[PDB]
Design a protein around this ligand. Structure first.
Ligand SMILES: *[C@@H]1O[C@H](CO)[C@@H](O)[C@H](O)[C@H]1NC(C)=O
Length: 326
């Protein structure tokens, strides 16, 4: 159903890409301490024009905030009814001025002190957006650690048109235990030390809280993560290996020129792709056409309302990943 594509201006949005999306979410605009939104960058502006020109049905939205963005500023703007009201008016004015069709609130992350005020902010923002038909979404966290204290999912659901669930970054630069999958679909069987660092657990968490699952999008990544100097498996399964050193996040479009993709191992239980290169001891966890196909099937099977992608511009020139997901 929905194909919600985040876009961060790595490269121009192509006319083929625009036709494969229902929603294009430019990323990012950030508010200052007074609720003034940063102006749309040139690369984001171009993608808006390219998307609308190539797909008259496409909704082009601005994601406000982001993983880099200080969540205490969201707290400040939303907690005060006066600043909440003016921030909302600034958002609505920003949409009209920049010819946008709506916005995504990417607040990473609301704390327990934010839980109710986040819902109030989204409900009020929806009310101001409703006459123009502007589309409202938010990005949701992937673990109970964040979800339980900070996310009133029923309340959020009552306000937004859909929820973009960030089912990725399950392992990363903070991981001290072992290598592991950035975005597996499932727990990876008996060798998996975790029940929850997978998309299925995160989506099931949301399914158990929200009224209408059609309002959920399962997020998928078009990027992967690498480690170097990686050693032996911890418990007989090559996905979880003795740590060397965190590498970086790589866009899919850049993996094939640095890794021999013919060495891809596809985990049959977790539904996730990785490469361990015994020659170099480099390790890459990523998503590829196979993992994305399995995830689209999961979404259809569970009746989830859509797929969201971070980020479509990380795809290769031939749209291997976007063509696989839809
Ligand atoms: C997905 O998660 C649910 C609930 O956590 C669990 O019952 C189910 O077995 C999981 N599916 C797979 C294939 O791991």
């Amino acid at each position: 159903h929905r194909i919600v594509g985040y876009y961060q201006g790595i490269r121009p949005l192509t006319n083929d890409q625009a036709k494969k999306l229902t929603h294009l979410i430019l990323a990012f605009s950030t508010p200052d301490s007074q609720g003034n939104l940063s102006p749309l960058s040139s690369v984001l502006k171009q993608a808006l024009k390219a998307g609308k020109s190539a797909n008259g049905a496409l909704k082009v939205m601005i994601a406000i905030g982001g993983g880099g963005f200080d969540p205490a500023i969201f707290t400040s703007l939303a907690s005060n009814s006066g600043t909440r009201k003016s921030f909302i008016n600034n958002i609505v004015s920003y949409l009209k001025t920049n010819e946008l069709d709506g916005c995504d609130i990417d607040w990473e992350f609301p704390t327990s002190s934010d839980k109710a005020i986040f819902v109030t902010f989204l409900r009020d923002l929806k009310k101001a957006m409703a006459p123009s038909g502007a589309v409202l979404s938010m990005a949701s966290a992937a673990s109970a650690f964040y979800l339980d204290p900070g996310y009133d999912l029923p309340g959020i659901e009552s306000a937004v048109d859909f929820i973009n669930v960030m089912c990725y970054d399950y392992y990363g630069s903070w991981t001290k235990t072992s290598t592991g999958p950035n975005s597996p679909l499932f727990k990876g069987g008996s060798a998996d030390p975790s029940d929850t660092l997978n998309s299925n657990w995160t989506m099931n968490y949301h399914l158990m809280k929200v009224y209408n699952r059609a309002k959920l999008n399962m997020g998928v990544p078009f990027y992967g993560k690498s480690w170097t100097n990686v050693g032996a498996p911890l418990n007989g399964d090559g996905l979880w290996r003795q740590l060397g050193t965190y590498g970086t996040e790589l866009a899919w479009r850049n993996m094939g020129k640095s890794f021999d993709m013919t060495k891809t191992t596809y985990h049959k239980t977790a539904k996730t792709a990785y490469i361990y290169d015994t020659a170099t001891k480099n390790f890459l966890t990523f998503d590829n056409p196979q993992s994305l196909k399995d995830k689209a099937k999961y979404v259809a099977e569970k009746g989830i309302g859509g797929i969201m992608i971070w980020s479509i511009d990380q795809d290769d020139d031939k749209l291997s990943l976007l063509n696989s997901v839809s």
